């Protein structure tokens, strides 16, 4: 699924991502956008051999199993397919477990390069949430 800005930002909302660790709607709404576009079911293959996964790019070597990633520990306890649908749950759920891990949003180098120190409640800017 490709969501639209404002649809994207009113799921999120709604799976609890609003202020989540501090970080405002706006921040979450703009890393999906430099991260898969919007779309769910945006893959990305890395140097490493791992994979990244879904609307918020998660990696096969830490959160998710997609079975050709030796050594990953998968600590969302989920197959990396699960990230691709277009019901947001799975990634969301996910996403909470990373950004609590220490260097917040800071694990998605899309936010910390494009999104970080920017403006970006303009991301939700004109929604009705
Ligand atoms: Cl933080
Ligand atoms: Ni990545």
Same mark, same amino acid.
């Given at each position: 699924?490709?969501?639209?800005?404002?649809?994207?930002?009113?799921?999120?909302?709604?799976?609890?991502?609003?202020?989540?660790?501090?970080?405002?709607?706006?921040?979450?709404?703009?890393?999906?956008?430099?991260?898969?576009?919007?779309?769910?079911?945006?893959?990305? !293959?890395? *140097?490493?051999?791992?994979?990244?996964?879904?609307?918020?790019?998660? @990696?096969?070597? #830490? #959160? /998710? @199993?997609?079975?050709?990633?030796?050594?990953? !520990? @998968?600590? /969302? @306890?989920?197959? /990396?397919?699960?990230?691709?649908?277009?019901?947001? *749950? &799975?990634?969301?759920?996910?996403?909470?477990?990373?950004?609590?891990?220490?260097?917040?949003?800071?694990? #998605?180098? &899309?936010?910390?390069?494009?999104?970080?120190?920017?403006?970006?409640?303009? #991301?939700?800017?004109?929604?009705?949430?």
């Amino acid at each position: 699924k490709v969501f639209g800005r404002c649809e994207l930002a009113a799921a999120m909302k709604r799976h609890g991502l609003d202020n989540y660790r501090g970080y405002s709607l706006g921040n979450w709404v703009c890393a999906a956008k430099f991260e898969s576009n919007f779309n769910t079911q945006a893959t990305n !293959r890395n *140097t490493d051999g791992s994979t990244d996964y879904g609307i918020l790019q998660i @990696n096969s070597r #830490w #959160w /998710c @199993n997609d079975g050709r990633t030796p050594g990953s !520990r @998968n600590l /969302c @306890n989920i197959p /990396c397919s699960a990230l691709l649908s277009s019901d947001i *749950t &799975a990634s969301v759920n996910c996403a909470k477990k990373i950004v609590s891990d220490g260097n917040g949003m800071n694990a #998605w180098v &899309a936010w910390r390069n494009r999104c970080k120190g920017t403006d970006v409640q303009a #991301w939700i800017r004109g929604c009705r949430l």
